[PDB]
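Why should sequence recovery work at all? Because a backbone constrains its sequence more than one might expect. Tight turns favour small or flexible residues, buried strands favour hydrophobic ones, and helices have their own preferences. The token representation captures these environments compactly. In the example below, the structure is given first.
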């Protein structure tokens, strides 16, 4: 099943990676992240589920036109930094698995800067 693995990439890994690394942001983004980390946990690997926070909306905001997520508590910033790094490692493995299965050539993307801060 190429489809099963494509759904993990398209419905979980890619949107969550983009939410924390691409400049795209809407009035729906915090709720979309909440949805990914609750409703779409069934698409995550067990390693990531160990560290992925359950809650996000009330822990951070984008302020002043910045692309950065501003965390209010250092501890939440640290939890998210750790989880994003795990998310990225899982993502690259799921990409490798997709290409192993599809038989096509690997173009592994470079890791982005996480758009997160607290200080
Ligand atoms: Ca918020």
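From this structural description, the recovered sequence reads:
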């Amino acid at each position: 099943r190429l489809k099963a693995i494509e759904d993990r990439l398209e419905k979980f890994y890619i949107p969550l990676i983009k939410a924390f690394s691409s400049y795209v942001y809407t009035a729906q983004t915090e709720d979309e992240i909440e949805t990914i980390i609750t409703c779409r946990r069934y698409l995550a690997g067990n390693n990531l589920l160990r560290v992925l926070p359950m809650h996000f909306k009330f822990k951070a905001d984008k302020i002043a036109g910045s692309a950065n997520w501003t965390f209010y508590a250092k501890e939440d910033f640290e939890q998210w930094k750790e989880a994003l790094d795990v998310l990225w490692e899982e993502f690259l493995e799921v990409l490798k698995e997709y290409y192993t299965l599809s038989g096509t050539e690997i173009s592994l993307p470079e890791k982005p800067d996480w758009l997160i801060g607290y200080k």
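A few observations help interpret the result. The pocket of calcium ion is lined by residues 30, 57-58, 60-61 (CB under 6 Å).
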